[PDB]
Curated annotation (Swiss-Prot), chain A:
This is Small ribosomal subunit protein uS19. One of its GO terms (molecular function) is structural constituent of ribosome. Transmembrane segments: none annotated. The keyword tRNA-binding applies. GO terms for biological process: cytoplasmic translation; ribosomal small subunit assembly. Pfam families: Ribosomal_S19 (PF00203). Coiled coil: none annotated. Part of the 30S ribosomal subunit. Binds S13 and L5 and cross-links to the A site tRNA. Belongs to the universal ribosomal protein uS19 family. Gene3D superfamilies: 30s Ribosomal Protein S19, Chain A. One of its GO terms (cellular component) is cytoplasm. The gene is rpsS. In the E.coli 70S ribosome in the initiation state it has been modeled to contact the 23S rRNA of the 50S subunit forming part of bridge B1a; this bridge is broken in the model with bound EF-G. The 23S rRNA contact site in bridge B1a is modeled to differ in different ribosomal states, contacting alternately S13 or S19. In the 3.5 angstroms resolved ribosome structures the contacts between L5, S13 and S19 bridge B1b are different, confirming the dynamic nature of this interaction. Bridge B1a is not visible in the crystallized ribosomes due to 23S rRNA disorder. Keywords: Ribonucleoprotein, Ribosomal protein, RNA-binding, rRNA-binding, tRNA-binding.
Curated annotation (Swiss-Prot), chain B:
It comes from Escherichia coli (strain K12). It comes from the Bacteria. It holds the Pfam family Ribosomal_S9. The gene is rpsI. NCBIfam families: PRK00132.1. Part of the 30S ribosomal subunit. Contacts 16S rRNA. Cross-links to the P site tRNA and weakly to the A site tRNA. The C-terminal tail plays a role in the affinity of the 30S P site for different tRNAs. Mutations that decrease this affinity are suppressed in the 70S ribosome. This is Small ribosomal subunit protein uS9. InterPro entries: Ribosomal_Su5_D2-typ_SF, Ribosomal_uS9, Ribosomal_uS9_bac/plastid, Ribosomal_uS9_CS, Ribsml_uS5_D2-typ_fold_subgr. Belongs to the universal ribosomal protein uS9 family. GO terms for cellular component: cytoplasm; cytosol; cytosolic small ribosomal subunit. Keywords: Ribonucleoprotein, Ribosomal protein, RNA-binding, tRNA-binding. The keyword tRNA-binding applies.
Curated annotation (Swiss-Prot), chain C:
Keywords: Ribonucleoprotein, Ribosomal protein, RNA-binding, rRNA-binding, tRNA-binding. GO terms for molecular function: mRNA binding; rRNA binding; structural constituent of ribosome; tRNA binding. The strain K12 sequence is shown. Part of the 30S ribosomal subunit. Contacts proteins S9 and S11. Cross-links to IF3 and the P and E site tRNAs. It comes from Escherichia coli (strain K12). The lineage of its organism: Bacteria, Pseudomonadati, Pseudomonadota, Gammaproteobacteria, Enterobacterales. The gene is rpsG. This is Small ribosomal subunit protein uS7.
UniProtKB/Swiss-Prot annotation, chain E:
GO terms for biological process: cytoplasmic translation. Changing N104H: In PW095; partially suppresses a rimM deletion. SUPFAM superfamilies: S13-like H2TH domain. Keywords: Ribonucleoprotein, Ribosomal protein, RNA-binding, rRNA-binding, tRNA-binding. Belongs to the universal ribosomal protein uS13 family. NCBIfam families: uS13_bact. This is Small ribosomal subunit protein uS13. Part of the 30S ribosomal subunit. Forms a loose heterodimer with protein S19. Cross-links to the P site tRNA and weakly to the A site tRNA. Forms two bridges to the 50S subunit in the 70S ribosome, contacting the 16S rRNA and proteins S19 and L5. The keyword RNA-binding applies. GO terms for molecular function: rRNA binding; structural constituent of ribosome; tRNA binding. Gene3D superfamilies: 1.10.8.50, 30s ribosomal protein s13, domain 2 (4.10.910.10). The gene is rpsM.
Amino acid sequence: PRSLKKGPFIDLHLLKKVEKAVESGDKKPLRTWSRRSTIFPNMIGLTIAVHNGRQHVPVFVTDEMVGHKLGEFAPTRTYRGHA
Amino acid sequence: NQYYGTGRRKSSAARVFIKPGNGKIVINQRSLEQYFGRETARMVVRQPLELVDMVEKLDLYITVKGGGISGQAGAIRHGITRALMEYDESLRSELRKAGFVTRDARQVERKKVGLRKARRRPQFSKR
Amino acid sequence: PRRRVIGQRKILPDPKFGSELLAKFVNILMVDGKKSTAESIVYSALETLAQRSGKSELEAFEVALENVRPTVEVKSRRVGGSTYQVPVEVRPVRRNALAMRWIVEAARKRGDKSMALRLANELSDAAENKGTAVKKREDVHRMAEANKAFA
Amino acid sequence: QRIRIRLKAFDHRLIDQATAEIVETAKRTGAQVRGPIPLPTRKERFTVLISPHVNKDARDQYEIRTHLRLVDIVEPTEKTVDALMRLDLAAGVDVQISL
Amino acid sequence: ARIAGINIPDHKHAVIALTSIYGVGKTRSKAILAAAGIAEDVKISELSEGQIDTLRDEVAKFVVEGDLRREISMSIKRLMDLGCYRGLRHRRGLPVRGQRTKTNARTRKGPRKP
Amino acid sequence: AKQSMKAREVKRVALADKYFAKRAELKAIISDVNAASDEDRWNAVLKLQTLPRDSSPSRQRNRCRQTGRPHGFLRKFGLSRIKVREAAMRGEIPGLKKASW
RNA sequence: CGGUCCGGCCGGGAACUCAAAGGAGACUGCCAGUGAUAAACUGGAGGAAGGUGGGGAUGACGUCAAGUCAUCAUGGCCCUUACGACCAGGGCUACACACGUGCUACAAUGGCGCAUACAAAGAGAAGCGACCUCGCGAGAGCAAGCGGACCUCAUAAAGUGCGUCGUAGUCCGGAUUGGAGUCUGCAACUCGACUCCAUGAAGUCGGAAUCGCUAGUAAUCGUGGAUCAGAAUGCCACGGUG
Ligand SMILES: [K+]
Ligand SMILES: [K+]
Ligand SMILES: [K+]
Ligand SMILES: [K+]
Ligand SMILES: [Mg+2]
Ligand SMILES: [Mg+2]
Ligand SMILES: [Mg+2]
Ligand SMILES: [Mg+2]
Ligand SMILES: [Mg+2]
Ligand SMILES: [Mg+2]
Ligand SMILES: [Mg+2]
Ligand SMILES: [Mg+2]
Ligand SMILES: [Mg+2]
Ligand SMILES: [Mg+2]
């Protein structure tokens, strides 16, 4: 995990949108490609449409999700049995 | 004055000085029995003086470097045999018979490309 | 080899008892080049066998080895359309090699609490004309005499 | 004070004649010199696969040997250090100097 | 004997015997014995009651047995409730920490089946 | 290698010198800092993400100079295992020759 | 040899090891026997080495329409608002399974703990990083030295001595999984390495079958390097026991 010296990581271009989304009240799902960004507490109760490689997947930020990376909630590979 | 021999074995080299005296042996300022813990080394370092039967009439100061236990033990035996042939050349015909004069040339064989070792080839399969 | 014949490599006698035969025995019990481990095991086994037997170490070892050295072995001999087992008078150096190999491999597979003690037990049994090394010698002789018709 | 010269080259004969020139000119100039010492020959080994494709076991192995020589001018009088500054050598020699 | 860890150690050196307590490895075992003031070589047999009592008292400072078990389970439960990638790997019985799955992973997948 | 790959690589190599070679202070002095306030460290962390991503030296591929091949590069010569041998046997490398021992 | 603080550390020596330029030595040269007054074979002397002394490089004419148009070059063909070019995210890391090459084991010729011996060969400036302080540890702070026979990487491990375990799925084995961290990097979710705590699978020498090796070899034990911000159980080298 990221070195505790540095503190958790978020992308600026996502944070700028989380800000105005909190001001607006998550009026619409916030599309993002920052799968690597960490879920900060200010994000709780927002819906972020995280890219998965071909689609944006709605994640509803439950309070239990804090401190995980967004991408952990958007699986990238499809499997459904061999036969 | 000192009588001298250089000897070597594998990567180990030894300088041996021998002089008349009451049988003392010293290696790197340590006793023979302190420097070597293995009985084979303790035997091979004596072998030449045992066969010459002078173990109680000569003393020797040794330094040895490089290689492991047996390399240094053989290097010391070789240096001892050279030095004592310098002390008494008439013993050479005996030491030749003892086989000590031969500088053992069995160096380690270098690794070769495509082989795991000197000669160990990778496992082969027909298919 | 088909071109060459090889002169034997120089062995060094055992440092404590002066025996090249005991040196060969050590060299057979040795594993992974851990010579000094094998030496320690052999010396412990020989001293305990000595105190059991009331014999010198080399004497007890020799009288044990006498009981297991084979006199004949079976060799596959080809014929223009068949193969037969035929008994052959094994030569003394191979006799010693076989006896030492059989002793060692018999001891190795014993259950006793240490290799030195396994070895001491197996040498006692061999000197007592009993046990796995002896039954190995025995069945070799049985097979030889069962094939004697082709000799 | 002394001055100390290290020569490096890829040819022991070139480095040889360079040291010979140094020593001869210096002693002709009245220098006291402590003679050329051969330092250990640092050598680089490389291994390359020589096929354009596959054939991992087909390889060539190459080496570069760097020869070194050390020489000390133990009484560098003005004319000797001047002359030693004036010398030129073949490009195969690197000369590095210290005081 | 028996300890605040509900199990029953016996007939063994204390430094090993304590490791029967679910949650106590070798270094915890040593820390327990150091703080209890007991020589690691001493068997549980011929151990004083004024020593087993303090062994209990010292082990009581660590989360062990059911306390640990449920905690571990709870954490795993949480992941499966989150539905995070790790939660999927857990519920689906596959390797969680990025091991190969072309082959191997046979401890996790369990015995092969055609 | 595809000519675009060469242009792309040289673009990255040039761009890296315009920033991180100078503004490395932003990470090494501040984002790594322990002796200084966490608010400044946070601001520096956020600022570093604003530099053009291709300016990171960690993104340079280090291709062979004569053909742009990525694999089999040798850092002593700047050449791939192929071109290095071609030059070697033609004697263009000033001290290299076949080894034996 | 003088001095010493016991440290080649000091004056000192150029002896010895070593560094590395040059030269010598091995030739069936010498001596019996065999052989076709042959070429050469057997044994012996001397020598460090004896019969290609050991190892490497060195690969004839050609076979397989063998491998590579994706290192590169090139005939022909095809695209030229796309089969060309830029960007973010994802994939090459999937997982019912089957095969190849390896690593670690199944233990007492051993595991654990304490002490203490003996290597070679390499790398270092967008580098190797000492001492000292902090941390259980990975590491952090400060900062000497080194473009190096000088400084750093860097206390080799097997081993030797002593104790303990007692044939147990164990004080064997360490996969899997939870928790807490370090470091590199814009960034370790998919998808890094490593450290600490906990957990402690299968496995008790492996069916038909099959592979390597002739001596400093096999087996076994450590060390280094290239690629490289980070990221070897692979590859290329080294020495110890043998
Ligand atoms: K436990
Ligand atoms: K073409
Ligand atoms: K492997
Ligand atoms: K690396
Ligand atoms: Mg193959
Ligand atoms: Mg890179
Ligand atoms: Mg030839
Ligand atoms: Mg074809
Ligand atoms: Mg193609
Ligand atoms: Mg991309
Ligand atoms: Mg792949
Ligand atoms: Mg068992
Ligand atoms: Mg052969
Ligand atoms: Mg080796």
